[PDB]
Amino acid sequence: EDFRSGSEAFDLIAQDEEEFNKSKKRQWALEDFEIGRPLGKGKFGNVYLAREKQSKFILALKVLFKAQLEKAGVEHQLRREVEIQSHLRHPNILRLYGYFHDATRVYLILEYAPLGTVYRELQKLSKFDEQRTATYITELANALSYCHSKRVIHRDIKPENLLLGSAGELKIADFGWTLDYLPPEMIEDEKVDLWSLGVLCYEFLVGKPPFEANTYQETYKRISRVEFTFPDFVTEGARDLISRLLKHNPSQRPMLREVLEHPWITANSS
């Protein structure tokens, strides 16, 4: 066996330290962008409507400030979400086109959603009819089955994290989200999204979530007891789907596929 001594050697490690490339995502800076009016303000920074100077492509630029990211200590959480959302392409999932950073700032290059959140739509329309609701639920189930196929579970689905494209299509935005040898005790979930889907369908039809109370403790009480009532104008299929989705035992909750097969969904989806 042959061994290298000192220099010729110390150069080996520093050569392979650079053949450790990992620069394989399009490179970006702030100068590639025109900045427009603010789309929103957040806990860690601000979102601006922006344009790539070259292509004129309209988009959203989320600036997060590394100062208040180091405070709450969510850096690696953010790396997780970013690596997730970068490798994820679907018409009902808001695209992460890219990301970059300087010091004190990390920028997220995101798809622009011109029709805002489903939360604002709910605030302005008070309630949705069954066509709009079933179409939202269909797009949601599509994005969620695509997500579950990529082994990623999004379990913070809610009208504030649902944006709308130009055609009014729903788009999931937030992503805050060994085996063959593991024993039973260490491996005993996705159905959580089915529950959230039931809650969302109810809120779309009625105007508020089925367990809303003026105190959080009362809502604990209602959720644990599955205590809620349907107003008159909620139809039977709608009632049927929402009741199937809001089962206390997660393994009694249908499969997203069954949701997409549900007769109410098929009849009302646009």
Q: Enumerate the known binding-site residues.
A: 43, 62, 111-113, 160-161, 174
Return the residues of window 136-195 that contact ligand ADP according to CB under 6 A: 160-161, 163, 174
Residues tagged in the binding site annotation for ATP: 43, 62, 111-113, 160-161, 174
Residue with tokens 């599509």: 142
C-beta of residue 96 within 8 angstroms of C-beta of residue 82? yes
- Binding track over 32-61 against a second copy, x by CB under 8 A: -xxxxxx--x---xx-xxxx-x----x---
H or E element in which residue 235 lies: none
Active-site residue (options: 2, 156, 193, 232): 156
Per residue in 180-192, is it b (16+ CB within 10 Å) or e — as a string? eeeeeeeeeebbe
Q: Is 172 helix (H, G, I), strand (E, B) or coil?
A: strand
**Residue 67 binds which one of ligand ADP, a second copy, none, with CB within 5 to 8 A depending on kind?**
a second copy
156 counts as catalytic? yes
98 contact choice in a second copy, ligand ADP, none (CB below 5 to 8 Å, kind-dependent): none
Please say whether the beta carbons of 66 and 116 come within 8 A: no
Q: Could you say which of a second copy, ligand ADP, none residue 39 binds, taking C-beta under 5 to 8 angstroms by partner kind?
A: ligand ADP
Per partner kind, with CB cut-offs from 5 to 8 A, the member of ligand ADP, a second copy, none near residue 40 is ligand ADP
* Cα gap 109→251, rounded to integer Å: 38
106-110/58-64 β-pairing: antiparallel
Positions in 147-206 near a second copy (CB under 8 A): 151, 155-158, 177-189, 191-192, 195-196, 199-200
Backbone angles phi and psi of 24, in degrees to 5: -135, 20
Is 32:52 a contact under the CB 8 Å cutoff?
yes
For residues 40 and 121, is the Cβ–Cβ distance under 8 A?
A: no
Q: By three-state DSSP, how is residue 30 classified?
A: helix
Q: For ligand ADP, which is the closer residue by CB, 99 or 112?
A: 112
Q: How far is the CB of 237 from ligand ADP (least distance, A)?
A: 31
Q: Does 27 bind a second copy (CB under 8 A)?
A: no
- Whose Cβ is closer to ligand ADP: residue 144's or residue 256's? 144
Q: Shortest distance, CB of residue 41 to ligand ADP, whole angstroms? A: 6
35 touching ligand ADP, by CB under 6 A:
no
Q: Phi and psi at residue 151, in whole multiples of 5°?
A: 60, 5
State the DSSP code for 167: T
What are the residue numbers of the active site?
156
Q: Would you tell me which residues interact with ligand ADP (CB under 6 A)?
A: 39-40, 42-44, 47, 60, 62, 94, 110-113, 116-117, 160-161, 163, 174
